[PDB]
Amino acid sequence: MLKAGVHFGHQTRYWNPKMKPFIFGARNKVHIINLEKTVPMFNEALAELNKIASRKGKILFVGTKRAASEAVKDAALSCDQFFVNHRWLGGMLTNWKTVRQSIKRLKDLETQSQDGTFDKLTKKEALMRTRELEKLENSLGGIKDMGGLPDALFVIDADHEHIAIKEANNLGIPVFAIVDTNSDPDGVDFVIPGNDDAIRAVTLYLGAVAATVREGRS
Amino acid sequence: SMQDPIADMLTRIRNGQAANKAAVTMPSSKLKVAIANVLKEEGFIEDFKVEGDTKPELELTLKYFQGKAVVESIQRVSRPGLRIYKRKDELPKVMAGLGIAVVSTSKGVMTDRAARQAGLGGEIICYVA
Amino acid sequence: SLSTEATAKIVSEFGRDANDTGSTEVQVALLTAQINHLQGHFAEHKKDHHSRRGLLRMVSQRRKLLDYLKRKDVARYTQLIERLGLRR
RNA sequence: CGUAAAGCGCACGCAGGCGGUUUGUUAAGUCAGAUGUGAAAUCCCCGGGCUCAACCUGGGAACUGCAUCUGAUACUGGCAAGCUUGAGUCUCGUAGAGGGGGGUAGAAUUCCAGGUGUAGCGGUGAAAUGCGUAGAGAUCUGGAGGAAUACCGGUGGCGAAGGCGGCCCCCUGGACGAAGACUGACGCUCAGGUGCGAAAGCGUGGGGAGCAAACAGGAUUAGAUACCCUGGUAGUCCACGCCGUAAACGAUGUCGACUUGGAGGUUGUGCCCUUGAGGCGUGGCUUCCGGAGCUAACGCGUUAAGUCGACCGCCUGGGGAGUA
């Protein structure tokens, strides 16, 4: 389509030979991503995400890149989506049993956050309180609505979120990930290509994965 | 120098299946075409083809049932430094029959099981598994 | 190094067909001429071990070529050594 | 067999081991069948007998071996004819401290003679031995002799290794490249054998400026046969002979093939816009990082310690001991 394939590859050195089945190579040694290999894995990926949304499972899309996470955290949340935006804490899925203590801490600090106990002792408890609330909200975000153990897991960049796909591989969660030339496609269950840094590409891919997943089956 | 082109053939096959090459191109010979016929009949490769009349070039199209390769192991048994000639009651079974042993017998080059059905011995070219 | 005109003369002398610079008689005659010239060189220049290694390489190449020609055709080998003057 | 024990310091090669590809053949190996034989006893498998078992015994099996007869080349080996794709040769060029001989040049050190000039120079953590009151050191002029070539100089280049650095000439070895031609397996490795082989050392004849084992003096120290200083002989230099060892190392033998990549260096070449030390390919040699894989790990990683093939060398606990 005209929406995909416009995004071009960057970082013309330190690419991957596993990626090399997906590069044109035109425009004087700049690694251009091939549209005809980008599109069918994308169509099958959205077919399987429709299958996951038919189960009413957790999607858990992650993006922590600079100048795109602010779009990730708000644009793709229609009604019930689950996001990670910034400061991706390592090992969240593997030891979510002891991250459950921190998320109960986030729930307790969100409860009565605007009245009562945090308003008493007006400033000296409260500056540390507000800093703790904002750092825990930044650390977790949509995990409070996610509630643990997602069915699928979506990744906006395999190289930046190589830890996330590693523990998703450990927990057996299917991975739907957009990769670049420098990133590794071996550990990804459903690999789709594209440009990770591009604001246009991340917005159109987020709109595409938000499309027809809002309803699932019914 | 090159002394065992058959070992070079199996070496190229093993390196291709390790490096996930789709096809292996190399110089050919009559023995190479016979071993390619045995491997194609037993299903360890997909296809083999000879190109050219001046320099005959052999292409083997390697196959993969999974992400892993089809051939689990490939080893040269009879060597130029040591040739192994075994009789009809002494030629072995690889993997208790799940693999094959390519053996050059008096009527042709075929599977060890085919040689045992034909009642012939010979030298084992290789073990395929 | 043996001169271009000298190599052309030896190729024309030892080639019964024109442009036979690769034949065993032509190679052995070229090596023999260079060996005689280097014997004249090394008599004045002893202790030139680095050039004598190339001399011994040429001697070994000439001996292996003569062994191959003796295995292939003994009449050509005898004719070549009786027109060159070696292997007594 | 990099680091635990283990790759000869390197190379050339005889015997030996192995050997690209196509077509004809007794078949030598090899394969298949049959025959003669492989004594009996003893292990093995079905039975009997001793009340059972050990023990005895019937038949078969086995003795994997060696000879004789019959078959095609599937492979190896021989003969015959081939092919070029391994190896090599020629044409034209390119880079390079590759080697041997000779000549020359410029800084600098030392010494001798001389001019100016005075009381210190040199050395060290401090001093002192030493040089200088017969004039040192310092500065300048002229002359003599020997050795090594600042800059260029580089994670550069060449050579099998050791190794090779000013410039010029003569003789000469090797490597690489576009293109074309030629011979047609002429190839790889190689125990013995032969050659090369740092520095130190040895013999003869020279040379000897610096440096410097030994030696002497002065320091240091509890002592100092040392580290330090002041001198200083062999030696370091040349010619011809020995010696044949090194942490001779990449602690990784040679040849051949295959296997993801990136960043440079050096050296050839094809195309593009002849307009530039600009762009796209193809070769060789190299430096660093790194994927799979391997490894005990460190790490190696297309120049492998990855996947194989050919051949050679070496190891079998430490010390004694690479000693008698």
Q: How many domains does chain C have?
A: 1
Strand partners, A52: none
Residue C17 CA distance to nucleotide D62 C1' (Å) = 71
Nucleotides of D under 7 A from a protein CB: 11-14, 17-23, 29-33, 71-76, 83-92, 98-101, 159-162, 171-174, 181-183, 185-188, 195-197, 240-241, 255-263, 279-281, 291-292, 306-311
Write out the residue range of the structural domain in which residue C51 sits.
1-88
Q: Where are the beta strands (DSSP E) in B13-63?
A: 23-27, 45-51, 57-62
C16 contact to strand D (CB, 7 A limit): no
> Does C9 contact strand D, using a CB cutoff of 7 Å?
no
Q: Which of A88, A82, A67 is nearest to A203 (CA)?
A: A67
Answer whether B107's CB lies under 8 Å from B79's CB: no
Q: Report which of residues 46-85 in chain B place their beta carbon less than 7 angstroms from any atom of strand D.
A: 54-56, 75-76, 79-83, 85
- Bridge partners (DSSP) listed for residue B104: B109, B123
Residues 20-49 of B with CB under 7 A from strand D: 21, 27, 29-32, 34
Range(s) of chain B covered by CATH 3.30.1370.30: 1-71
Using DSSP's 3-state secondary structure scheme, residue B103 falls into strand
Which residue type sits at A62?
V
- Taking only Cα atoms into account, the Rg of chain C, rounded to an integer number of angstroms, comes to 14
User: How far is it, in rounded angstroms, from Cα C31 to Cα C12?
Assistant: 15
DSSP letters along A122-176, please?
TTTTHHHHHHHHHHHHHHHSTHHHH-S--S-EEES-TTTTHHHHHHHHHHT--EE
CB B100, CB B112: distance < 8 Å? yes
Looking at this protein, which amino acid is placed at residue A80? D
Tell me the three state secondary structure of residue B15. Answer: helix
Strand partners, B100: B128
Give the number of residues written for chain C. Answer: 88
Instruction: Tell me how far apart the alpha carbons of residues C14 and B17 are, in angstroms, rounded to a whole number.
Output: 53
Instruction: Output the distance from C62 CA to D97 C1' rounded to whole Å.
Output: 32
Distance B83 CA to D62 C1' (A): 28
Residue span(s) of chain B under CATH 3.30.1490.10 come to: 72-129
Closest Cα to residue B56, out of B20, B38, B79, B31? B31
Whether the CB-CB separation of C17 and C73 falls below 8 Å is answered with no
**Contact call for residues B28 and B53 (beta carbons, < 8 A):** no
Token digits of residue C63 = 């001996």
* Dist CA B21 CA A61 (whole Å): 35
The single-letter DSSP state of residue B101 is E
Six-digit token string for B111: 């599977």
Render the burial of B49-85: b for 16+ CB within 10 Å, e for the rest: eeeeeeeeebbbebeeeeeebbbeebebbbeeeeeee
CATH for C58: 1.10.287.10
Q: Which of chain C's residues 21-80 bind strand D, using a 7 Å CB cutoff?
A: 21-24, 26-27, 30, 34, 37-38, 41, 44-58, 60-61, 64-65, 67-68, 72
Number of Cβ within 10 Å of residue A75's Cβ equals 15
Contact A212/A190 with Cβ under 8 angstroms?
Answer: no
In whole angstroms, how large is the CA radius of gyration of chain A? 19
Tokens representing residue A101 in the block: 């203590």
Q: DSSP assignment of C11-55, as one string?
A: HHHH-SSSS-TTSHHHHHHHHHHHHHHHHHHHHH-TT-HHHHHHH
C46-74 burial string, b = 16+ CB within 10 Å, else e? eeeeeebeebeebeeebeebbeebbeeee
Task: Count the neighbouring beta carbons within 10 Å of the beta carbon of residue A53.
Answer: 20
Measured CA to C1', the nucleotide nearest A184 is D291
Q: How far is the CA of A185 from the C1' of D148 (A)?
A: 62
Q: SS3 for B105?
A: strand
* Nucleotide closest to B76 measured between CA and C1': D308
SS3 assignment, position A86: coil
Domain B1-71 has CATH 3.30.420.40: no
D310 C1' closest Cα residue: B3
Which CATH code for domain B72-129? 3.30.1490.10
Q: For Cα atoms A89, A91, A95, give the angle at the middle one, nearest 5 degrees.
A: 120
- Nearest Cα residue to B83 out of B104, B68, B63: B104
Distances (CA, A) of B10 to A176, B15, B73, B99, B124: 38, 8, 10, 15, 14
DSSP string, chain A: --SSS-S-----SS--TTTGGGB--HHHH--PBPHHHHHHHHHHHHHHHHHHHHTT----EE---TTTHHHHHHHT-SSS--EE-S---TTTTTTHHHHHHHHHHHHHHHTTSSSTTTTSSTTTTHHHHHHHHHHHHHHHSTHHHH-S--S-EEES-TTTTHHHHHHHHHHT--EEEEE-SSS--TT-SEEEE--SS-HHHHHHHHHHHHTTTSSS--
